[PDB]
Amino acid sequence: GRGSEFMIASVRGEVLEVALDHVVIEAAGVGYRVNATPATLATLRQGTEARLITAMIVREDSMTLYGFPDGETRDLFLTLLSVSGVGPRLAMAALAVHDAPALRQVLADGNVAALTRVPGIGKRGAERMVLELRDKVHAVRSPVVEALVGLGFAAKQAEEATDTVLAANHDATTSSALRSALSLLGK
Amino acid sequence: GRGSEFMIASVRGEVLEVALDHVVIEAAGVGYRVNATPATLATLRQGTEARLITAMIVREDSMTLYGFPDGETRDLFLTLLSVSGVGPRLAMAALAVHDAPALRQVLADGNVAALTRVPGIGKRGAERMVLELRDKVHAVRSPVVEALVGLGFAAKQAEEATDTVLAANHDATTSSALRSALSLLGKA
Amino acid sequence: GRGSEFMIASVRGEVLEVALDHVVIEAAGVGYRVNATPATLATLRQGTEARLITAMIVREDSMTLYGFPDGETRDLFLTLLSVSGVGPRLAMAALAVHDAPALRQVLADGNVAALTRVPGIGKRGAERMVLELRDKVHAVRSPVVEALVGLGFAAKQAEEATDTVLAANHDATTSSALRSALSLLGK
Amino acid sequence: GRGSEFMIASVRGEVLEVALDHVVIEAAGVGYRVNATPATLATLRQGTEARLITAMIVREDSMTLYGFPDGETRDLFLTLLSVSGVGPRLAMAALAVHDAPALRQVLADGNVAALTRVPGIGKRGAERMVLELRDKVHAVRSPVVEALVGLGFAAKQAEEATDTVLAANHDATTSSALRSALSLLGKA
Amino acid sequence: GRGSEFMIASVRGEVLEVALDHVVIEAAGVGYRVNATPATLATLRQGTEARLITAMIVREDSMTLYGFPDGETRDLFLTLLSVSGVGPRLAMAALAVHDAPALRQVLADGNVAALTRVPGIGKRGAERMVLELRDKVHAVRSPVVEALVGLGFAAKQAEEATDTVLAANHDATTSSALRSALSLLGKA
Amino acid sequence: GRGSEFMIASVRGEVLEVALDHVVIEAAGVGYRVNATPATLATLRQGTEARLITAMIVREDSMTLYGFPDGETRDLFLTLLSVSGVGPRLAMAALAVHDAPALRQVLADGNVAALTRVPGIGKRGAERMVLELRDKVHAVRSPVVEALVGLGFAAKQAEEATDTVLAANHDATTSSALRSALSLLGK
Amino acid sequence: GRGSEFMIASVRGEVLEVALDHVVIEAAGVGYRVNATPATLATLRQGTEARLITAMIVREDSMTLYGFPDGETRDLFLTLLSVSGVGPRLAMAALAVHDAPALRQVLADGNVAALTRVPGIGKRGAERMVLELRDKVHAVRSPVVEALVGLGFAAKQAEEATDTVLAANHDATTSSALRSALSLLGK
Amino acid sequence: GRGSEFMIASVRGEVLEVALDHVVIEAAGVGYRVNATPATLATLRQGTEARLITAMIVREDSMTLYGFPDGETRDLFLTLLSVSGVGPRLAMAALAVHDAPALRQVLADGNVAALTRVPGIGKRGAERMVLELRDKVHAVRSPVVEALVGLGFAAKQAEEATDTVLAANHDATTSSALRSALSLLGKA
């Protein structure tokens, strides 16, 4: 029941405008407005071609883009959104204050004081978050087991089947292992 | 009353990212995220130009793409969605487990055991599906009636007319066959 | 309170697929599916570049395109939609049976029998429609005052103005007339 | 709680149609319809490439674009929308009658008679507006603190932090301040 | 597809307040507000027990009652609402001006001038209405077919059957006539 | 995820009006309109006090009551509604044609011809329904474990419990069994 | 386009509970919760029969009652709601602080300081309100002219017709004047 | 921004049906269905007059009642609903398993094992809850200030005002304070 999938996952074009809370990348003829942390905007230079990994949020009366330097960050954004009470604006505020690397450690360390330093986040609030996602921020194995659970399998069920595929083909990809694990799992 | 029509029916561009449950095709300047079965993702190679026949799902708070190698598969996806209780994720799960060819036979054969092996599908569930669509997976003759049918007509009426036109002009194409018929039924 | 304005008013690209009830035009990299009457689809040829004047319909759980050879037809489509009880599909059915020219006369003539010939349209239904829009299917003076009225003005004020501008620059474009008339009405 | 952010902030392409209340710019292959004042449409020439800074409005049953020559104007549009009772059509009507420069002075002067000259705007109406936004139509200190306040801070804290930064780098820019002020504000 | 069915079809209690556009009937302990034409309100007397045949309108953000002296009138109200463009307030305005008997003749006569005299109704408007419902304002025979008709049948089918039953049992009531017919069409 | 619970489950008052498709029961001072099959309406007599077991349906722009002679029938109504494509009106049509007893056998027998005899029900439609609910139309042990499972428990835990309580108080009511079994499962 | 009409306009029963922000009146068997100012609650006494003139607010996910000692107050409540930015809770807060009589003068006097004394109301806010409704807080004439405008007539049009009716029947009611004015206005 | 207020806060009538997951109380002529824990249903006896303190939940497509023996319990129900992820069915499940007294201690003790004993509640889930409301399950000073805070005031102001009042009338009641504190707070 975990909410994850949007449509526009990045925008690449010429920077038309760099503001303090967003940017305007022109892809094709369209100027998309993507909001962003100053940290992100910082690297941007009007007149230059640039790409931002974006997350798209559609609501009944809204259709907005949030951009980031890379996928890891964007993904972090989405994660933040999962905590109830934490909305896009909020999440952006936190990242604006604490870059992805920092914000990640802040949570994993359990560092609450750092979080309260972010407007909108109450003492109680900081805790819930750290709880919700301290343990949420070539391997091959953990990648493929991770995915089989999304297709609605179990942890154990998926780990059995995975060791199995690798037990037979060690030098296999993270993809051909997936298909071999599934072609295996549909009996 | 059958739900069928979307807007983005395909995306062609450069592959920016190949994941385990989706891909990112960059069309124009935009990186569209389309979800896909590993089977589909398998053929894809980052840095290469590629095209996926997609189905688009819009909901109040969501706007998602599902991609597939070809039209037949994508159409199969839509079909699956018709069964109540069966949602996009579910349908993708099934195709992820059983490729289109396989999944098709699984239904036509009536093969229930195969279906239950798909997470989220209960014994009762598998049956309903097989029921709902065992008989749903230059012809010229049947596509024309199929058209008329969706224009909200009836299977004798539009059958008789298609029959009638293919009778009088033999070197006629599925579409000229379609217009000719429509000219008749609007009682010229 | 009359509903009129959408966003995608046309699509130009390569025809990827011509079906019996729609087409797939590829603009940029995107393959847009626009539905269409066989009459319209008829002219289309896969592999060829083509343009369709489209009407866009967005609903909570839907986002669809309807395409047409020209603006006059597309506009007629929208009109049809205005009649309550008449939905996009219905409207398309009617045009599929009666081309724009025909369908227009069918209404203006008041020809009800022709309309009932269209699935979904009952006897009662045909009448309401003919009622609703029998009187609804280089000029210059008329278009401008109409636009102004369209902004909430009063035909007299809007004639005074227009007549003024046109008297001053007889060879005026309809549009310059519009600017030049409003430039007047703020005083 | 102030509503501000959309997605399509401009459209650049070839002008396909210039009407009296809108234009059709073709970006990529798509013809986007953006509504506009005759004043704006005036400068436009079919067959020519053009760009309009747009504001996008999405509602349950609607998805519309409004275009303008530049950012200042488009922003003014959004502002007008903030006044309750004032909708997109209305706001467009006012700008159609009074160009941005004019319309701005009209409000700052407090000139009510001018506003009532716009259909849909009652006497009472004109006042509310002038009220709501008479005081709303290398600087550096201010821009910066404005931003923070937007990130949810308080004018006190935002300023305090800021003098503190610019102290340390009088040389600073409007953004390089912003970050340092955020570094600062994070108790680093 | 015709919209007809609500929940509160009447309110009986003590009149607590008689206004110019509504009344407050207290049923049980609850004071229901039902709106009404002065014509209707006219008969009402505060402190007295009274009953109004009501029509209930629920919308996302609204839950309102409209009351009338009798069923025929209330039903007339609903009818008016069927015409698109005609809302509850409008319909109440018309009845407020023209009592049910009058308003009925106004339509059946086709009398357009009378209708335009009602605020909100334009010349074009009056016509559409007269069109839409000039032919819409122990019978035993027609109520039975009327029933079947709303059960989603057709006017020959249900006509033939009603015909057929009234033929074989003569001392039969509109309802026994209804069941008997339904027993037939479910192909006993 | 199964939709079941409403608020007005019955109405008792004086019959003010008996029509062909509904009745008006006056409870307290309010005249509630409940729709009903002629079969149901048949038994009703204006001027008499009567009670109808009702199902309530609320939608954004609607608030309607459907009434029935007894609980078993009303419940059957709800069931019918579960089949997608089958709306309140439809469901009422079916019951109007086939009384509860009949309509129940029609499904359990699998009798499709009978169902198509009902307007709005297509051949395809009849089948789906029979599929969906052929196996869906003083016990004691069964009702309790079922309720417990109904709260998310596991038949085994819920049998252990029940069996325990019933072994201890054989003459137990189904309900006391329920309390006494849960009083157990918190430990 | 002015929003005014609800359904439950009062509740009369036995007071079951008197709290600090609401009360529970039991009408028939139902305990309705109506929210109220302490000022209002003050007069209330549990175990006693009481009546509160109520305003009902229904929203997609809400159905709430607000009660008041009399109609004038309740009506004032509704008025407050008309100011955008001012919600039920807010309006109640203001009345909780300033009784109807007081709150009325506060607005008519134009007294802004008094309004800012109410939590949630900013300086800017207080002004808008005073603006919006300073001129909004047996005559016979003004009553009946007031009503004809709601039926969608004009001020002048309605005043002409009204003087007319009274010019002919001075000793007429505020009601028989209304019908005589309308029976007159439908020509 | 805390969600609290409904309309039907109790139902009193004759018990028409006692089930395993709900009851049917007939108030006036209406049979209201209120859902309840077996614990609660236990005390109920068909044919008898009874009262349940209820909480009402209205959603776009739903309108449901949940009943409880007393106010403290019903309030506890609402509380549980505040935890995101915890819905009416869930909350009812927990109370069904753990009576109000028990369930209260379970949280205040911080007893997680007990909570996981409730279907739908995961390990992670139990923690969040205990977190969210361990400190949430003639006094006079406090009640009073609580109220004000509810009217939008700030704990500082609310208290300050309050000591100031009770100073002037040590004798005061929880409400007669409230008003005076509001008199006060209005700068009288």
Curated annotation (Swiss-Prot), chains B, D, E, H:
Location of the region described as Domain II in the Swiss-Prot/TrEMBL record: 70-137
Keyword DNA damage in record: yes
Keywords: Cytoplasm, DNA damage, DNA recombination, DNA repair, DNA-binding
GO biological process: DNA recombination; DNA repair
Pfam families for the chain: HHH_5, RuvA_C, RuvA_N
Region (Domain III): 138-188
Classification via InterPro entries: DNA_helicase_Holl-junc_RuvA_I, Hlx-hairpin-Hlx_DNA-bd_motif, NA-bd_OB-fold, RuvA, RuvA_2-like, RuvA_C, RuvA_C_sf
Quaternary structure, from the entry: Homotetramer. Forms an RuvA(8)-RuvB(12)-Holliday junction (HJ) complex. HJ DNA is sandwiched between 2 RuvA tetramers; dsDNA enters through RuvA and exits via RuvB. An RuvB hexamer assembles on each DNA strand where it exits the tetramer. Each RuvB hexamer is contacted by two RuvA subunits (via domain III) on 2 adjacent RuvB subunits; this complex drives branch migration. In the full resolvosome a probable DNA-RuvA(4)-RuvB(12)-RuvC(2) complex forms which resolves the HJ.
Protein name: Holliday junction branch migration complex subunit RuvA
Gene: ruvA
